[PDB]
Every structure is written in structure tokens, then in C-alpha cells.
Amino acid sequence: KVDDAKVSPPKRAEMKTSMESLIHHFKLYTEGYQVPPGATYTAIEAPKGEFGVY
């Protein structure tokens, strides 16, 4: 996963030993990461055709 504790949670050992990691785990699992404003349409070739998300 992306090595960015403001987006992806830290490891359990880091969360239980590091204050920054514990804070980021708390915030990610309570509030969640903020996403910059904007709209996107991303599509993939799912087995049934184009599957997209706007």
C-alpha cells in the first residue's frame, strides 16, 4: 500500500509503538482521509464490459 499514513493505515506494530502512527490510525478509522475537491469518471474493462465510476 502507499507509504502515506494520511491515506493508508500504518502497521499494527507501528500503531502500537509510534504516536504519529496511532494518531493516523485513529483518524483514518474514525473520520477517514479527506479527498481534494473534484469530479472524475474512471472506467475499467470488467469481465462484463466497461465498469465505470463517476
Partner 1 sequence: GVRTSPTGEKVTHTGQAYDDGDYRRVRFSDRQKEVNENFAIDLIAEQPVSEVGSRVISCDGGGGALGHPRVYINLDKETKTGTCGYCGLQFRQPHH
Partner 2 sequence: NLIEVFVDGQSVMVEPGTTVLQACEKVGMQIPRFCYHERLSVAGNCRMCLVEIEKAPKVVAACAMPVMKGWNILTNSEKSKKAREGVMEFLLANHPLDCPICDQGGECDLQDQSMMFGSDRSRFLEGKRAVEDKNIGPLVKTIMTRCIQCTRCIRFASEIAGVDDLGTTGRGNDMQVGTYIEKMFMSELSGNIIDICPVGALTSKPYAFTARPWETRKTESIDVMDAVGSNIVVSTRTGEVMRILPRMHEDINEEWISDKTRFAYDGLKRQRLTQPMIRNEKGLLTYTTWEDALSRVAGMLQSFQGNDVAAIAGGLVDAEALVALKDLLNRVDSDSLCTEEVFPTAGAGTDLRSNYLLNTTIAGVEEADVILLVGTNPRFEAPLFNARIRKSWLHNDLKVALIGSPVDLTYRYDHLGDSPKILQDIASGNHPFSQILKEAKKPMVVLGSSALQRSDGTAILAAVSNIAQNIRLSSGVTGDWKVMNILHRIASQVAALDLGYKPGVEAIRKNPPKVLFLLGADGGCITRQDLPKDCFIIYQGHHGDVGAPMADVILPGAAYTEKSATYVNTEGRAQQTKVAVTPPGLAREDWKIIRALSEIAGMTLPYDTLDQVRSRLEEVSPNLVRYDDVEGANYFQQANELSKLVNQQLLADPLVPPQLTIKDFYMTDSISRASQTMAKCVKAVTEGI
Partner 3 sequence: TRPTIRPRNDVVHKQLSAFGQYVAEILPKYVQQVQVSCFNELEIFIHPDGVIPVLTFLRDHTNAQFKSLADLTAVDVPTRQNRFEIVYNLLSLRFNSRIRVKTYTDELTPIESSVTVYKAANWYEREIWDMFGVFFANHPDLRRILTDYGFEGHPFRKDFPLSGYVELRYDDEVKRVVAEPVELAQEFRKFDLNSPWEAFPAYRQPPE
Query: What does the binding site for partner 2 look like in residue numbers (CB under 8 A)?
Result: 4-6, 10, 16-24, 26-27, 30-31
- The reply on whether position 22 binds partner 1 by CB under 8 A is yes
Contact of 1 with 8, CB cutoff 8 Å:
yes
Question: Are 22 and 28 in contact, with CB atoms under 8 Å apart?
Answer: no
**Which residues are near partner 3 by CB under 8 A?**
2-4, 30-32, 34, 36-41, 43, 50, 52, 54
**Which residues are near partner 1 by CB under 8 A?**
12-13, 15-17, 22
